[PDB]
Amino acid sequence: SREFDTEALVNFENDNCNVRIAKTFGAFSITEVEATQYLTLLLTVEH
């Protein structure tokens, strides 16, 4: 239930605006929170 800092933190990522613009001109799911919860449980059970 603990709130995760998904949006809060900013981290390095593939951010080539040129690629984004080129793509724009050429034109059941799991959330980040769920993935974080799931990782937490997996690591707990790993311990």
Partner 1 sequence: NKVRTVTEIVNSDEKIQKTYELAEFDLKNLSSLESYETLKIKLALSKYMAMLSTLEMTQPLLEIFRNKADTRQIAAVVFSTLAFIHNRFHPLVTNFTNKMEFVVTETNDTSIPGEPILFTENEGVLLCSVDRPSIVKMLSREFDTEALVNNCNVRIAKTFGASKRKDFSITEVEATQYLTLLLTVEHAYLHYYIFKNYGVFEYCKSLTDHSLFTNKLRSTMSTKTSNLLLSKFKFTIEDFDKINSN
| Angstrom distance (rounded) from CA 36 to CA 27 | 32
C-beta closer to partner 1: residue 33 or 41: 33
Query: In 10 A of CB 11, how many CB atoms?
Result: 4
List of residues contacting partner 1 (CB under 8 A) = 1, 3, 5, 7-8, 10, 18-19, 21-22, 25-27
C-beta closer to partner 1: residue 8 or 45: 8
What stretch of H or E contains 40? helix 32-46
Q: CB of residue 22 vs partner 1: minimum separation in angstroms?
A: 4
